[PDB]
């Protein structure tokens, strides 16, 4: 008809809000990772690098067992040593970049604990179903 | 296309149902004729206009469903 325009919901422009709003727009960003004589080799190498990075990410997600979904809970408890704060402030005041800058130091130990809990769980489930 | 299938929450399966209702606007017909006589190619040719409209509905339906059930499992 006449009068109605066209509205999008696009790229990272939603990266200046609290935690709650931004999480509503994850999917689009996740979709924009695999879009698509001395110079051809360069672009070919770049494409190969991008594919390798994507596969690395996919495997690293697969190991934890939360594959096939955008959100996933886990059993590791949260040590208060890192940043006490409290839930309401964390979810209604800060932006993503500030949080990332805030939790840059203790990154690897969390991955280690996640991996360990996942492994113990699958082993327990495996012998458990071995009993049945 | 693997990723595109993955987004719609039907990974690892060759068949998958979903909640979006079927509007009669696109093509009324009826079950018997479509599942008996029509072939694949002609069907594709005849529904070649309303693909992009369809994809977004599935996407948003999955997103809303997952967000809703997250709270239910959270209060558990």
């Amino acid at each position, epitope marked *: *008809a*006449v*009068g*109605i*325009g*066209a*509205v*999008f*919901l*696009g*790229f990272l*422009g*939603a990266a200046g809000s609290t935690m709650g*709003a931004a999480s*509503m727009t994850l999917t689009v960003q996740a979709r924009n990772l695999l879009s698509g004589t001395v110079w051809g080799i360069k672009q070919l190498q770049a494409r190969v690098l991008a594919v390798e990075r994507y596969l690395r990410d996919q495997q690293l997600l697969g190991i934890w067992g939360c594959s096939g979904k955008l959100i996933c809970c886990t059993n590791v408890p949260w040590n208060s040593s890192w940043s006490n704060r409290n839930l309401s402030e964390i979810w209604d005041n800060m932006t993503w970049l500030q949080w990332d800058k805030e939790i840059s130091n203790y990154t690897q130990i969390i991955y280690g604990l996640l991996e360990e809990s996942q492994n113990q769980q699958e082993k327990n489930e495996q012998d458990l179903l071995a009993l049945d | 296309d693997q990723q595109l299938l993955g987004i719609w929450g039907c990974s690892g399966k060759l068949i998958c149902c979903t909640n979006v209702p079927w509007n009669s*606007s696109w093509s009324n017909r009826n079950l018997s004729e479509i599942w008996d006589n029509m072939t694949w190619l002609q069907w594709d040719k005849e529904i070649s206009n309303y693909t992009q*409209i369809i994809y*977004g509905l599935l996407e948003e339906s999955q997103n809303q469903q997952e967000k809703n059930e997250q709270d239910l499992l959270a209060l558990d």
Partner: antibody
Amino acid sequence: QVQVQESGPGIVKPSETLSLTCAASRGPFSGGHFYWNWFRQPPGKGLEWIGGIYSDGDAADYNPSLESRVAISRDRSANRFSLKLISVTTTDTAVYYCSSTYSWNNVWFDQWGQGVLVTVSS
Amino acid sequence: DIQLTQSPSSLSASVGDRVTITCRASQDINTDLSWYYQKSGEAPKLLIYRASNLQGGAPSRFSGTGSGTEFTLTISSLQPEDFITYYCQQRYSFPITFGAGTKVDIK
């Protein structure tokens, strides 16, 4: 999700110039077109469309009857839009509204705010 | 300008009744038509779009149909709030027109 408010004088003498203004927001959406519209309704009769303008252009479109007595402007710094009306008369005494209509895929939303009264008297 | 005629101009029935209103266009407008509902002391809010796309949040008792130069709205059961003003209008090329409107009353 957008709120809208109106701003203008309460009483203006006949034949003077009436200036009205209305603000707007962009909501969670990132980029698109918001066809802003100005509507009116006199008491005790049907509504009537005054005019429209895109949020990314300046070719303000007016109804054929009141082409000569309407001017529409937009301000990007203030993200506002204003209307000027000349040769005011007692008939213009009415409730006026600024509205926007989204353009999402096959939904056709619409907001209407609250509007404001305008009275012409001596 | 495309002229739209509403019928009945006024009506009065009891609560819980089934009623029907009609809006006739002066010419063929296809299906780019929508009805807005409004009450005293409030700005209008859209009721139905295209006469075949139910607006979210509306009660299901309202149904809309029609085509060409004739469109119809049927209410299965009256409610105290249903006694309100309605306006059929056309979202077509310029200009833009709106109906006279109909008021439902208690009897």
